[PDB]
Amino acid sequence: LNNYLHVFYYSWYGNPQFDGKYIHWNHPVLEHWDPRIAKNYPQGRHNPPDDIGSSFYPELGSYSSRDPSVIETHMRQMRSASIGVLALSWYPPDVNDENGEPTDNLVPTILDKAHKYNLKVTFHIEPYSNRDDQNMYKNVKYIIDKYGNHPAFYRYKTKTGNALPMFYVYDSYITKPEKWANLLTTSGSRSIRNSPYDGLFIALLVEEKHKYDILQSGFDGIYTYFATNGFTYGSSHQNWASLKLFCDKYNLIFIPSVGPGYIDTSIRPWNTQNTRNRINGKYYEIGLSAALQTRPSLISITSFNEWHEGTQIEKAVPKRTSNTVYLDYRPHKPGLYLELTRKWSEKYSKERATYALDRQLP
Numbered sequence: 001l002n003n004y005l006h007v008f009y010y011s012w013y014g015n016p017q018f019d020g021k022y023i024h025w026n027h028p029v030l031e032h033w034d035p036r037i038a039k040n041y042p043q044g045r046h047n048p049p050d051d052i053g054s055s056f057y058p059e060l061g062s063y064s065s066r067d068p069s070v071i072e073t074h075m076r077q078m079r080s081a082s083i084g085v086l087a088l089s090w091y092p093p094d095v096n097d098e099n100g101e102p103t104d105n106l107v108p109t110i111l112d113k114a115h116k117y118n119l120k121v122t123f124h125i126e127p128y129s130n131r132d133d134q135n136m137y138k139n140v141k142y143i144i145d146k147y148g149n150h151p152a153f154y155r156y157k158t159k160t161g162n163a164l165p166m167f168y169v170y171d172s173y174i175t176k177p178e179k180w181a182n183l184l185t186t187s188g189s190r191s192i193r194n195s196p197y198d199g200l201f202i203a204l205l206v207e208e209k210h211k212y213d214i215l216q217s218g219f220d221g222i223y224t225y226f227a228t229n230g231f232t233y234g235s236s237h238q239n240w241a242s243l244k245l246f247c248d249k250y251n252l253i254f255i256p257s258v259g260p261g262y263i264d265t266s267i268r269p270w271n272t273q274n275t276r277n278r279i280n281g282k283y284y285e286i287g288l289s290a291a292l293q294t295r296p297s298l299i300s301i302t303s304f305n306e307w308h309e310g311t312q313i314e315k316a317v318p319k320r321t322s323n324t325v326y327l328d329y330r331p332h333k334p335g336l337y338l339e340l341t342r343k344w345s346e347k348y349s350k351e352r353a354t355y356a357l358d359r360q361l362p
């Protein structure tokens, strides 16, 4: 099991049996800002179980995130892929993404099941409304207080010093560097540094210029998230070497994000430019290789189960309806992306052990 391979995990799916209605599977088709364009594309809410807001279809159907055997199945697959950590998409209590319901109440279950399969759970802080340094203090405190003592709570284990909680902060650039420094620098007015709520905060880098803002803010690392090679400066493989050089200089953890493909045209029909065909694993393996070549401290996978953007490595099956041929992993099996990850996890795990200075060869 690889403690340095993280995967982004979503717990926002619901169905009639466990949630009293469908959630997320019935995603609306998103409206292009220009109405002259939007009118040429589909409109309205997908209708599960046969019509869902994904280009692929899961082996578990249009499942519920709070169905305990779904959570267990997911824990199995991750373990079997040799992924040690799930980075759980997180919104504060009684808050949600605009197309979903609250999910913080499910965290205790997920931690218990992760523990059962000896996996760890870190937190992917979403851009909730009015997120700032002040309510980020409160939420870091909350997370560490409520879940910090749980045996599946993730901490990055340094060789010396106390192991630190990790927080991936999606859309960190929305908040100005001077606000972040209140929280993340040593002498900031609401500094968590050297406090019981310290951790490793990882910022999303989109554009190259965001590098400097990230330094000024006091973040401990960067990650790139997007599965589409070429969508952002950060998500382009060719820039990964430089980002790594930058992070090395400034003592930041570089965490590249690798995906198996991308397709979101079931909810963003206009966004065909960011589609990337999986070509039977080749796209994903080009990604993993590019990540490996930078000799990173951690690698992140986008994603376990973001079905809307088609970046999932979770088991998918062929499916056809009277108007839809879903994409699938044929001619390979539903577990293809799990098997490819297991391969590359083991390779990373072996190569990574030779990075450290104490391990360096004569």
Ligand SMILES: [Mg+2]
Binding pocket: none
């Ligand atoms: Mg160091």
